Amino acid sequence: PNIINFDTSLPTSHTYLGADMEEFHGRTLHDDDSCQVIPVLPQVMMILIPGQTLPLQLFHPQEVSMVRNLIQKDRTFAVLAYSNVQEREAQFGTTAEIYAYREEQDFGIEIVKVKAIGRQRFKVLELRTQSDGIQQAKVQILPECVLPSTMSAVQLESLNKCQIFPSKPVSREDQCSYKWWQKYQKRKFHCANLTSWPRWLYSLYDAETLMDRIKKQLREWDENLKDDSLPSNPIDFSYRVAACLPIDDVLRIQLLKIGSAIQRLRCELDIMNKCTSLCCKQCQETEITTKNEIFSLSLCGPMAAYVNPHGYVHETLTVYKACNLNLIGRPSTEHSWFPGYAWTVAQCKICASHIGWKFTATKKDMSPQKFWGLTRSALLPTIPDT
Amino acid sequence: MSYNYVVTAQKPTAVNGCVTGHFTSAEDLNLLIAKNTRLEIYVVTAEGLRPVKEVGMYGKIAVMELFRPKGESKDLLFILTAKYNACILEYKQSGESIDIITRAHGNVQDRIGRPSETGIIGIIDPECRMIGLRLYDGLFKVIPLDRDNKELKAFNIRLEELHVIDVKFLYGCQAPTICFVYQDPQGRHVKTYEVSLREKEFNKGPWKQENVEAEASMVIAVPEPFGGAIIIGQESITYHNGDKYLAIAPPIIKQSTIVCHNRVDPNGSRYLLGDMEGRLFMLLLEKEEQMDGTVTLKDLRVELLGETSIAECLTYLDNGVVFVGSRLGDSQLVKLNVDSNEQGSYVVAMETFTNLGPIVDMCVVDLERQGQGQLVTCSGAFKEGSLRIIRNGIGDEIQKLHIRTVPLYESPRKICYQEVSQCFGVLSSRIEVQDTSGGTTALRPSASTQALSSSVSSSKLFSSSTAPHETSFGEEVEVHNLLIIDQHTFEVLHAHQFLQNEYALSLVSCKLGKDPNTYFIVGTAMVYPEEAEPKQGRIVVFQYSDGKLQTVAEKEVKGAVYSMVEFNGKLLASINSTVRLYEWTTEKELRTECNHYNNIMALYLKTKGDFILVGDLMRSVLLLAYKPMEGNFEEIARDFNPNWMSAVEILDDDNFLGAENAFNLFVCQKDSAATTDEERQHLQEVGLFHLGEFVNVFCHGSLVMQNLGETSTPTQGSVLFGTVNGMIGLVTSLSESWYNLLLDMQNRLNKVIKSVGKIEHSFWRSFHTERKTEPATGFIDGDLIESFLDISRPKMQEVVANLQYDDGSGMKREATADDLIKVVEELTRIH
Amino acid sequence: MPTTIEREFEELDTQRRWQPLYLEIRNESHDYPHRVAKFPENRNRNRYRDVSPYDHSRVKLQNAENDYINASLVDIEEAQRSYILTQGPLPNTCCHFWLMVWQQKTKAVVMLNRIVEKESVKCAQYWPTDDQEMLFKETGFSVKLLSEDVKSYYTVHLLQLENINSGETRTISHFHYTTWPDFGVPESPASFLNFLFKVRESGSLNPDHGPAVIHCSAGIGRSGTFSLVDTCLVLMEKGDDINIKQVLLNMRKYRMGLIQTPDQLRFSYMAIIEGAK
């Protein structure tokens, strides 16, 4: 089941129409705590977090006018995090900038194959409905607060030369390199003896230790993940792990509201340690899969955002085994998605509703073999799992 | 809102650095000691230290140095604070009045830049042509000295090497040349540069950048003889000078890490080395000659001079006597001797100076006469550290406050007091090195071992599997004990020992339920290096009677209990982001009543009747209310502004005081009665004040006397806080009129008073952090008000020009030095 | 002189391309949001959780709070005759259908399947065979049958739906194609031609009253083919010949009124050819 085959680069490429993307890589930065007017693209209901790549297909003439308007502009558009779908119930969102755009205008209608990426988070101040073609909202950007090392306060000035230590001996080849972490704690957090808390408590708030703890479990999820792929910065690492968390909207917006990277890492670790069973969205007495069957098949992680050829985004989750699921369709490749893996609609026995797809390699000699493609919306994790 | 008054009741006693020079006069040798924000100048007399001055400048001391720029005599001082407030000082004496004049000053902060994790480096060119500051990564600030740069205008030179361990200037060079070791993936390399002010950039180094030991940390510049520099690592000492490279690896220094150094003689033949654990060695240079221009070293030799306190700085002053500026313990004035003392130690101590040091915990306890409440603090760490008893006045010794030391030779962590047994429940922990196969051994005779009774906990719980495999030969494992210490003789009566690899987190003394007996409740957590987050802990209870302890109850908790308080009639504990209320049954057993989960690790826990303040390390503070008619906790208000945070306290039912990163104090007020529910569910921050000290513990009570003026006292309530540098400050609450009057006084005093380094007091006290820097609000700098009476009468007249205010705060009657003096001398009694 | 439509029909029969034709017409079909029609609190009122009426095509003529309807309206400018599409009438959706046809000024009702198709319940019966007047207090509706009106190949169940609270009445020629089993087509297209001629001559295909409502308890499999043959008859018989597939795609933009089997397409083409002249 753990045999490694086929390259994880392909799903991230979003091979839906080929190549010749905009690919400007120019990026854009906005002043924090400022108040910017920004167009909100409608009918894109989903929680987007920074760093995540979002594919989009547009059919509404208002939306294609929006696409053009962005394409001359800085092309950063808002994506609200609808707490309730009732009308909007929107208080926070995430700006997304375009990095990949092509236009074909198939038949007499117009189609847009824009791919964007989230950049910054914000708190919505005035939603409004100006430009009845496309809603523009005036929002306040949430600043990214970064904290210094918790031992910088005590500041044992003589010991300051000992704050720099040799790098990890080897990435994972040596088990004695775990003693390096046991030695890292003794050196960096020695000045904790001047405070009222033990050394290990401060290690529970260190960014590096939390990053390594997550990285260890991520490599437990994927033995082939290896190093050099995850970002070194704590801020980007926290966002990347948040992308691959099979959680509901309430937890997702809870993660988005968190400003400090250390807080994000701590809560990501707690969810990653607690939630170990996913049931159906409505019938909680299903228990489709547990934590021990998750595996990543793309660099973004076990979870990724894809769009069917209808404009509907699907936050799929790759998983080895899914129980109480019955196939509906037939193994037809049709759309690319995962290259040459086909798809069959799946449903839970108790609840007559869509859950995900089933991918079976068409070449019969691919290691991923048969896996499941469950979606976030159809799955509801349980905190106690009991 | 939330008008508060903060006054230092005890100056900081931990030294950051001390320098020997000729500051006061060319013919006098001076020692300058930097106790955080207090610079003190002493004069050596060959029989001791003669204090000559003390100055409380507005800021910390990031770096301090002495240099004679050859332009004049009497030497000069350079000071750089944590807020980048560099200044040049001269000791100008006028007959009898002693003054510290500022030749030049300037703020040397960069607009945009991440401060280097290594920290501030403050090197001075031996020719005094320049000074070099390492403040930020990849940059090297330079300040020339030519009598012109009176504004301390510095320019930054780009540096390719990012991670720099230590930098120094080179003796005997026609142009200013620096040397520094740095870390790259290849390893640690010692590079050098030739900084030139002509092109305002660097040049080629005199020699190459050979590799050094992977743990190279110290760089030392020997004087013009021998040239070159010395690199000190964990286990290797090397000397580099051009082609010459001579390295030795003595086994004596292998035990610990060298963390202190300085020259011994102007020729640089001898050097003093202090290590991490307090041992002191002396390094020798052979001064080998072959012809003119010897510039050679035959070999290097070190010798274990002896054992002193844990050194933070060392200065060889006068001869034989060396001032070891300890920071964890108490600074000494030990004297070197050419001959051993029949014990292998060439060092003999002759004077020690008090140092409350860390003050990890405090206990305001009223001893003998009621009202005169003394303070007991758990100072120091490792072999240093003691119970410190501070008593204000005498009702024999003649001192404003008397300090009594009770050495423990191990680090204490928490303390409680018991009236019934008249005892002190002090938590403590020692370090033991594992044997080849034994159960570890001690290193010193500690308090937890030299006791009348030495019972050990033998609980049957926690019989699960574990892998101590990691326990190699040299493995300093912490053994935790609870010590029952007599109130009167302060002799350790009992030394109960906890389970192996069990961390005693919290301790309290209370009288639970209807039971008359009082107990010491100790909450401990089972910790294992493999497990990042502890999962098992226990709440044990002890009763002390007839000179013995007895575990009368011990409750498994399946968590890591961090802090426990005595909720009226019950036990309020915090386990793991859960706050649990335990009831004391008549069967002598804790019984859980209700547990509330608040999604944040409840580190700090305080009570104010039925209100409970819960605080995470990262500023997450929330309020809870225990409704007795039901028996559950309802969340009242919360506040999440992610920032480092060290302690909390409840001033009253509405204001909550706490500490924050960069040595700051904050007061959050529950406004309540708001129009909107979500508005009244959020605590409004009100007070911000850059204290300049890392507050470690809060404690209600005062050290002066009981209520003297009853309700006529302007100050309402009074708390004390103990810090890491040793200051014990006092915080009180005031009225609106008094707050306005004292703030006007503060502004006018800042207008009239002259600081040291020409540093604005408003900038110094402004709440400083990485997010922003707001000016201080809601706090009154009690030190300034108390210093108001310390200036001349003409200054008092100049500071009261058109005040009005004054007596009774009525009819805006004009002010005079009769009630302002009165109000100041009344305020100076609260502490 | 035969037209190119008959030649294309014969070509499709010869090369056996009906199944590929339907497959490609379904692949080239395009969907529309229809997001409002599906809600977590609306699944109870949705007869089929699979299908969903497009938000732009569907009209929420409810004049109240919430009150979801699983209905839709189609309006093609080429035919100038709007039609209403619905689903199996659950009692809540039954009252919704009552108010829908009451507000739309409907003139006829077309039912194309039995209650007991495949010996099972697929649509909920709501019209009595005899008069059997019934008053529903959910919305103050009155149900009564004008006559039995049994025909050779079908039946007419004309109702006299009256609102008492509003105080008005409306007579609708509620047709009912009796000779039709579910997921199938009648063998004789002549009966279909006669029935559709009778319906078109009944005033339903006129702007006199509100658009007629056509339903087969699903509004997709059976109503779609009838609607497309009707629009083809009123589209290309009145002048220049128009290709069937393009206008079929155009009306498919309104709703997914597919056929689920190219046999229905063959029947539609046969009926259109028979109704040429």
Ligand SMILES: Cn1c(=O)n([C@@H]2CCC(=O)NC2=O)c2ccc(C3CCN(C(=O)Nc4cccc(CS(=O)(=O)N5CC[C@H](Nc6cccc(-c7sc(C(=O)O)c(OCC(=O)O)c7Cl)c6)CC5(C)C)c4)CC3)cc21
């Ligand atoms: C969806 N998609 C994806 O997801 N991906 C990727 C795949 C990769 C992956 O891994 N992930 C993804 O995301 C796709 C990739 C490619 C593509 C191609 C694929 C092909 N394609 C279209 O299909 N376009 C399209 C356009 C408009 C509308 C529709 C909907 S539809 O075609 O029209 N339709 C189907 C048949 C249903 N039939 C039914 C259902 C329920 C009940 C009854 C009863 S029960 C009953 C009784 O007896 O009671 C009845 O009555 C009998 C009578 O009266 O006849 C009756 Cl009827 C009957 C009705 C229903 C639901 C409405 C479809 C073009 C693009 C599609 C992807």
Ligand SMILES: [Zn+2]
């Ligand atoms: Zn289900």
